[PDB]
Design an enzyme around this catalytic site. Structure first.
Site, short mmCIF file in Angstrom:
data_model
loop_
_atom_site.label_atom_id
_atom_site.label_comp_id
_atom_site.label_asym_id
_atom_site.label_seq_id
_atom_site.Cartn_x
_atom_site.Cartn_y
_atom_site.Cartn_z
N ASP A 58 0.84 -1.19 0.00
CA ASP A 58 0.00 0.00 0.00
C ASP A 58 0.88 1.24 0.00
OD1 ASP A 58 -2.89 1.08 2.00
OD2 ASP A 58 -1.62 2.21 0.64
N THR A 92 -1.23 5.81 -4.32
CA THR A 92 -0.05 5.75 -5.17
C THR A 92 -0.20 6.64 -6.40
OG1 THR A 92 0.40 3.50 -4.42
CG2 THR A 92 1.47 4.22 -6.44
N1 LIG Z 1 -7.00 -6.65 -13.58
C1 LIG Z 1 -6.59 -5.40 -13.87
N2 LIG Z 1 -6.24 -5.05 -15.13
C2 LIG Z 1 -5.83 -3.81 -15.43
N3 LIG Z 1 -5.72 -2.82 -14.53
C3 LIG Z 1 -6.04 -3.02 -13.23
C4 LIG Z 1 -6.50 -4.36 -12.82
N4 LIG Z 1 -6.74 -4.28 -11.50
C5 LIG Z 1 -6.46 -3.02 -11.10
N5 LIG Z 1 -6.03 -2.27 -12.13
C6 LIG Z 1 -5.64 -0.84 -12.09
O1 LIG Z 1 -4.63 -0.57 -11.12
C7 LIG Z 1 -4.76 0.80 -10.74
C8 LIG Z 1 -4.13 1.11 -9.39
O2 LIG Z 1 -4.61 0.31 -8.31
P1 LIG Z 1 -3.60 -0.10 -7.13
O3 LIG Z 1 -2.36 -0.63 -7.80
O4 LIG Z 1 -4.36 -0.96 -6.15
O5 LIG Z 1 -3.19 1.25 -6.36
P2 LIG Z 1 -4.24 2.44 -6.08
O6 LIG Z 1 -5.57 1.74 -6.09
O7 LIG Z 1 -3.83 2.96 -4.73
O8 LIG Z 1 -4.02 3.42 -7.21
C9 LIG Z 1 -6.25 1.11 -10.82
O9 LIG Z 1 -6.43 2.39 -11.43
C10 LIG Z 1 -6.83 0.03 -11.70
O10 LIG Z 1 -7.41 0.62 -12.87
#
Ligand SMILES: Nc1ncnc2c1ncn2[C@@H]1O[C@H](COP(=O)(O)OP(=O)(O)O)[C@@H](O)[C@H]1O
Ligand SMILES: Nc1ncnc2c1ncn2[C@@H]1O[C@H](COP(=O)(O)OP(=O)(O)O)[C@@H](O)[C@H]1O
Ligand SMILES: [Mg+2]
Ligand SMILES: [Mg+2]
Ligand SMILES: [Mg+2]
Lengths: 526, 529, 98, 170
Positions: A58, A92
């Protein structure tokens, strides 16, 4: 410098040095935080001075547990903290977009421009982006399948798929079970408890309550199959008068009389409880459980145990509301008006022991409005990680319910805003077009980082993504296992509208305020 | 010369004294080294032929044992990866109670094998998925190897024969005697219902003669002294009190106020008469011995001696509860004559001396009772502690046998069979996970290799012979310890078995720890305080 | 090398040399009470930190008065104490036999 | 009976409390490893007012340790008699946002003191040892005395605070 001639021990950085310092700090932060984004990000291990271990992914935890003493880092950390405590996600992306905005701004400032032009461009671009986001959103009925998709998307980025599939159902079920179709969702009605054994795939949801303390008297029953529940916060210990008092006796018989007489106040309350129990549970078929927020003397414990009562003492205050909501009774501060209408009902009460610790389970409530999430795992860091993930998922589902809309994800929205802003920018007059271009290029950081983390070529992947969405008006995002363009809505990748709105607002405000600093000075007392 | 100043950004913004490691070369390859060294540290204490180890902790206390959990607890580790392996071992000990060295050996082997896959090109994710698939396949395979399940957990000889092995792995030579003692003690307290509490077996150590003079007693012993003149009772009715054996007073401050002289002359006489009346009222019910948890008064002791009452004072707040369970009495929070239901019964209560130690014994003739005690006699406190640990492992094995009735062969046979079958399965899987599956299969030979090395033979010949004999369909063949030439022996006939649940949990926890160590990418350490 | 396993200051010794060292230390411990055996045995005088003197011919007393801190040597003191507690005589013979 | 629980706050407060617990332990029959050697029964009459006995004969103090630093509690643990404290009786940047800083720390302290007061039978009071003029004793101690009083507004709270020409007719 003027300041130095007055305070020789001061420290100062003037026009260009301040901007250089701020840009360098922002880029340094983003260089480390860019590896967390997406489900393909890596896990960081943090070791404190005491020797503890924390595995994390996180952004907020990394920001507040990485060792840094920079003022700009402090500002960005405060902004991330506000983002976290309001929305629950997007920590992030905040840092990523702030860093990219500052870098792109410095790219044009290095050629002799003034920061105010870029500031005006930023404002115009923000207004256009908000207008576009207001129309790109998708409004739905928010049914169980949609909530499952949203929760799985939010949880898959913290733990592996096997555990995420377990956590998603529990989170969605708890949120739905504590929900009425009005009176916006109130957390603190879901309890998070952790028990250290029985590997995490056993994490579950209990339609009842779990208390981290148990019965204190050995002879009390260990299991009740049909229980009346009494909840109170009256004191059953020995109490001393507020004004100073003392016994003055003459002989041993008088001393004995006084000793006997100094307990009637508490024995009266114990008798009231016993009479109510005998009135309600006539035969030995049902059970009686008492929960008290205050202490209970050994004499009172023995008196209650002689009639088959299961008593628990010194519960927490929020459990007073939770037990009322779940079982359906009344929390009362006095026994003057005791009546069966103040009792609750519970279909099962039992006890579990873990070495030096004891737990009590209240289960099989009729229509509970409060539930519990029971976390399990073989490590303290595992439990902490799962707790953080559960917080993220609950916040995501609650925000999705509170809003009437959800948004496609995986960078499709960023691509769409970049494309819209590029066509918007010729309408602006002056040099603010450069600021608009910088804002778009900053917005294009998320798909780049996702592709880089998945292991593809940034330029080629982004060129393909922009090649689509222009010949077909679809919302197109990045596929993380093939690198090809995809449609987020059909696959099932969703994001929150409020998160994007708050993120845009905060990033723009912080970048605009940072770009206008003229000097950095430390001239006060040490 | 010149200096390399620093790198801009995080390298400049880092605090003083902090450490930041990143990449395969600076994090993974060092964590693997730390775990490998930790495993090598305790490799030599595995099996019947394991050698004892002497550890002195930070308080200059001396430990002599070959129990992996105790060794790891007494050592202090500064490396986080070894810390996680240690916590995995401790969790295994808490869950089952035996198999704390298998976890370390398996985790070290798995990591040292994943290192070469990372070297030859596979990434961490492909190793992790292969390990997970192999672990699931192993858990699926394991039940088919179950043989010779437990039949009767209330037969002394069968219980001794089932518990012999887990004691023989620590006390080579005394295993028969220790198994007999522990079997008697465990069978004594086993109720009709399956519920078997581990806490109901007490251990008492008296310095003196040799181990062979240990014994088991159906009751309780305390290292105390009788407070009264009476010393022995032949048919004891016991009263138990939690309050002090004295006249009670008010909780609030009290004061004796007198305005004449008659009250002054009568107060002490009245108090003494009241105490005498209370004591005689207690004694009239037929109580022979009074047990109290607090202070006794001189006048109360005088009257108790007058009325021939044995007075014992024990004070732990837990020994009192254990004595209440043993005799069948209920502690009374006020000084009142007991009712029959509150009155305990014990056959013999007396004071004895063993090897310069005064003890008080509550003894029954009943073979069941509620709890039982084991009295150990040794010439050294360290030796007595080691025997205590062996007894604890035996009790835990009995409890696990109560939980589940299935056994599997030991001495390397199960590991060899699992390795062979997992290799056969991983041969037919197309893709890049077949290398990880084959490495997971190969990691199972570490246990028979360690056994052979500790025994003092050539491990390669032992492993080759085990494979050759297992290729013909003999699933119960393992290492022979007695022979001086590397050889094999049928384990089912020899009675070298071990529990199914322990192997299940050990494999699960070892795999989880290994993959958790492999998942870490970069490390941030603050300066120690 | 960058991060070490155990804490700095730890000392370890394994193999034949440490076993030989233990055997050597037991010899010194037995030499401490060697000449106090038999009808023509002498006795020893021990002076402590506070200047208080103790004149003794008892093996257990002499061994207790010596401040032995060797882990292998402590066993010979332990067995002497055990013998004294159990039978009350024969404290030197057991150490010599060991 | 009449159990009393103790709170230690700040660096100097933690040191003073550690010294007090050390000296009371040497006065009683308690040793660093949590076992008992005392020969006089009067050393064991009132042992339950300050100690909880665990299953196995070990004793633990009824004390709580709090500081806004990851080094003070570690220093106490490293120092002698620091291992006898229960490992979960510890509470551990200075100012985040949240509109209120320390709200989670005070909640953790309240939870731990609730769990500690659960074990005792008839507790009577809290002995708080903290700096008085210090920042942690005034501001970062965000009316912790007030919070304790609100939690338990019936028990005593004893705190060891560190110390003229016009003179005519009328
Ligand atoms: N299966 C997936 N395929 C493509 N993009 C994804 C998928 N799961 C999550 N994301 C993308 O990852 C991005 C960032 O999420 P995360 O890495 O949890 O950090 P945060 O949510 O704090 O920005 C989100 O904007 C989401 O669109
Ligand atoms: N008589 C025996 N012959 C061969 N192997 C044995 C014998 N007794 C025990 N073992 C083996 O010793 C192994 C490890 O036992 P031990 O050394 O006590 O460590 P742990 O049980 O903690 O792993 C077991 O796998 C068992 O198969
Ligand atoms: Mg997220
Ligand atoms: Mg074993
Ligand atoms: Mg002699």
């Amino acid at each position: 410098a003027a300041v130095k001639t007055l305070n020789p021990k001061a420290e100062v950085a003037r026009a260009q040095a301040a901007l250089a310092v701020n840009i360098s700090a922002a880029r340094g932060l983003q260089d480390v935080l860019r590896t967390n984004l997406g489900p393909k990000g890596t896990m960081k291990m943090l070791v404190s001075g005491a020797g503890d271990i924390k595995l994390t992914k996180d952004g907020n935890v990394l920001l507040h547990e990485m060792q840094i003493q920079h003022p700009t880092a402090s500002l960005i950390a405060k902004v991330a903290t506000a983002q976290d405590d309001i929305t629950g996600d997007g920590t992030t992306s905040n840092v990523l977009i702030i860093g990219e905005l500052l870098k792109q701004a410095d790219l044009y400032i290095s050629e002799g421009l003034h920061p105010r032009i870029i500031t005006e461009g930023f404002e115009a671009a923000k207004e256009k982006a908000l207008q576009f986001l207001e129309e790109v959103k998708v409004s739905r009925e928010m049914d169980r399948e949609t909530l499952i998709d949203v929760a799985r998307t939010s949880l898959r980025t913290k733990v592996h798929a096997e555990l995420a599939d377990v956590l998603t159902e529990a989170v969605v079920d708890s949120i739905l079970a504590i929900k009425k179709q009005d009176e916006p969702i109130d957390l603190f009605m879901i309890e998070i408890m952790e028990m250290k054994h029985k590997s995490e795939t056993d994490t579950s949801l209990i339609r009842g309550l779990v208390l981290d303390h148990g019965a204190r008297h050995p002879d009390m029953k260990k299991r009740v199959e049909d229980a009346y529940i009494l909840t109170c916060n009256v004191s059953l210990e020995y109490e001393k008068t507020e004004v100073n008092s003392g016994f003055f006796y003459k002989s041993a018989e008088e001393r004995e009389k006084l000793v006997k007489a100094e307990r009637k106040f508490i024995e009266d309350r114990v008798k009231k409880i016993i009479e109510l129990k005998r009135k309600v549970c006539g035969d030995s078929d049902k059970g009686f459980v008492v929960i008290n927020q205050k202490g209970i003397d050994p004499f009172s414990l023995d008196a209650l145990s002689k009639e088959g009562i299961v008593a628990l003492r010194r519960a927490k205050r929020r459990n007073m509301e939770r037990l009322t909501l779940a079982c359906g009774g009344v929390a009362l501060n006095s026994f003057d008006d005791l009546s069966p209408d103040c009792l609750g009902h519970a279909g099962l009460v039992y006890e579990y022991t873990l070495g030096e610790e004891k737990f009590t389970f209240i289960e099989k409530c009729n229509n509970p409005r409060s539930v519990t999430l029971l976390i399990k795992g073989p490590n303290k860091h595992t439990l902490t990680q799962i707790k953080d993930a559960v917080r993220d998922g609950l916040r995501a589902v609650k925000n999705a319910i509170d809003d009437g809309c959800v948004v496609p994800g995986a960078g499709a929205v960023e691509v769409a805003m970049a494309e819209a802003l590029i066509k918007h920018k010729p309408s602006v007059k002056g040099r603010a077009q450069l600021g608009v271009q910088a804002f778009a290029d900053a917005l294009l950081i998320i798909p780049k980082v996702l592709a880089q983390n998945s292991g593809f070529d940034l330029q080629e992947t982004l060129v393909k993504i922009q090649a689509e969405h222009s010949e077909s008006g679809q919302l197109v995002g990045v596929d993380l296992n093939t690198g090809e363009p995809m449609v987020a809505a059909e696959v099932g990748v969703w994001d929150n509208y409020c998160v994007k709105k708050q993120l845009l607002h905060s990033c723009t405000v912080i970048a605009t305020n940072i770009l206008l600093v003229d000097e950095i000075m430390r001239a006060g007392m040490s | 010369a010149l200096h390399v100043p620093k790198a801009p950004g995080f390298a400049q913004m880092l605090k003083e004294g902090a450490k930041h490691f990143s990449g395969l070369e600076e994090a993974v390859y060092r964590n693997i080294q730390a775990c490998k060294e930790l495993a090598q540290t305790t490799r030599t204490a595995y099996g019947p032929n394991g050698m004892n180890k002497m550890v002195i902790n930070h308080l200059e206390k001396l430990f002599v044992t070959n129990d992996a959990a105790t060794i790891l607890r007494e050592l202090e580790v500064q490396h986080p990866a070894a810390k996680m392996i240690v916590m995995a071992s401790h969790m295994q000990e808490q869950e089952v109670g035996d198999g704390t060295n298998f976890v370390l050996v398996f985790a070290g082997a798995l990591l040292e094998l994943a290192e070469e896959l990372l070297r030859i090109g596979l990434s961490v994710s492909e190793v992790i998925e292969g390990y997970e698939i192999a672990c699931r396949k192993a858990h699926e395979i394991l039940p088919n190897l179950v043989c010779c399940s437990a039949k009767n957990l209330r037969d002394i000889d069968e219980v001794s024969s089932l518990l012999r092995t887990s004691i023989m792995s620590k006390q080579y030579g005394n295993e028969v005697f220790l198994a007999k003692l522990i079997a008697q003690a465990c069978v004594s307290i086993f109720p009709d219902s399956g519920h078997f509490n581990v806490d109901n077996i007490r251990v008492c150590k008296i310095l003196g003669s040799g181990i062979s003079s240990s014994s088991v007693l159906h009751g309780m012993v305390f290292k105390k002294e009788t407070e009264g003149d009476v010393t022995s009772v032949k048919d004891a009715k016991i009263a138990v009190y939690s309050c002090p054996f004295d006249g009670m007073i008010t909780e609030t401050k009290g004061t004796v106020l007198i305005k004449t002289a008659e009250e002054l002359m009568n107060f002490s006489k009245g108090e003494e008469n009241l105490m005498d009346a209370q004591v005689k009222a207690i004694a009239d019910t037929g109580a022979n011995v009074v047990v109290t948890g607090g202070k006794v008064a001189d006048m109360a002791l005088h009257y108790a001696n007058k009325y021939n009452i044995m007075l014992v004072r024990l004070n732990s707040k837990w020994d009192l509860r254990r004595l209440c369970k043993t005799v069948g009495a209920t502690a009374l929070p006020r000084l009142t004559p007991p009712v029959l239901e509150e009155m305990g019964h014990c056959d013999s209560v007396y004071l004895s001396e063993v090897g310069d130690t005064q003890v008080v014994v509550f003894k029954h003739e009943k073979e069941d009772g509620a709890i039982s005690t084991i009295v150990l006699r040794g010439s050294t406190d360290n030796l007595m502690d080691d025997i205590e640990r062996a007894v604890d492992d035996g009790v835990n094995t009995f409890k696990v046998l109560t939980r589940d009735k299935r056994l599997v062969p030991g001495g390397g046979a199960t590991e060899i069979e699992l390795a062979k079958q997992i290799t056969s399965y991983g041969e037919t899987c197309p893709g890049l996970e077949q290398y990880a599956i084959k490495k997971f299969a190969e990691a199972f030979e570490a246990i028979p290799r360690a056994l052979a090395e500790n025994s003092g033979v050539k491990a390669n010949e032992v492993i080759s012979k085990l494979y050759a004999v297992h290729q013909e369909g003999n699933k119960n063949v393992g290492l022979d310890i007695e022979a001086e030439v590397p050889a094999v022996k049928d384990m089912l006939e020899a009675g070298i078995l071990d529990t199914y649940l322990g192997k299940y949990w050990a494999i699960k926890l070892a795999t989880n720890a290994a993959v958790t160590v492999l998942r870490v990418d970069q490390i941030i350490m603050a300066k120690p305080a | 090398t960058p991060v070490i396993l155990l804490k700095e200051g730890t000392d370890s010794s394994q193999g034949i040399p440490q076993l030989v060292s233990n055997i050597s230390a037991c010899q010194v411990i037995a030499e401490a009470v060697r000449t106090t055996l038999g009808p023509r045995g002498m006795d020893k005088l021990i002076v402590d930190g506070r200047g208080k003197a103790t004149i003794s011919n008892d093996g257990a007393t002499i061994l207790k008065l010596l401040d032995v801190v060797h882990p292998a040597a402590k066993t010979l003191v332990d067995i002497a104490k055990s013998q004294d507690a159990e039978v009350g005589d024969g404290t030197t013979s057991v150490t010599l036999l060991a | 009976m009449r159990e009393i629980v103790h709170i230690q706050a700040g660096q100097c407060g933690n040191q003073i409390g550690a010294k007090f617990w050390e000296v009371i332990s040497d006065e009683h029959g308690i040793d660093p490893t949590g076992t008992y050697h005392g020969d006089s029964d009067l050393q064991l009459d009132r042992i339950s007012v300050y100690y909880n006995e665990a299953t196995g004969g070990k004793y633990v103090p009824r004390a709580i340790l709090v500081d806004l630093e990851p080094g003070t509690m570690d220093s106490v643990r490293s120092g002698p008699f620091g291992q006898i404290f229960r490992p979960d009786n510890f509470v551990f940047n200075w100012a985040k946002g949240h509109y209120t800083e320390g709200a989670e720390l005070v909640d953790s302290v309240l939870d731990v003191v609730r769990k500690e007061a659960e074990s005792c039978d008839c507790l009577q009071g809290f002995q708080l040892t903290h700096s008085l003029g210090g920042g942690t004793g005034s501001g970062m101690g965000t009316l912790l005395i007030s919070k304790i009083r609100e939690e338990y507004p019936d028990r005593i709270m004893n705190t060891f605070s560190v110390v003229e020409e016009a003179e005519e007719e009328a």
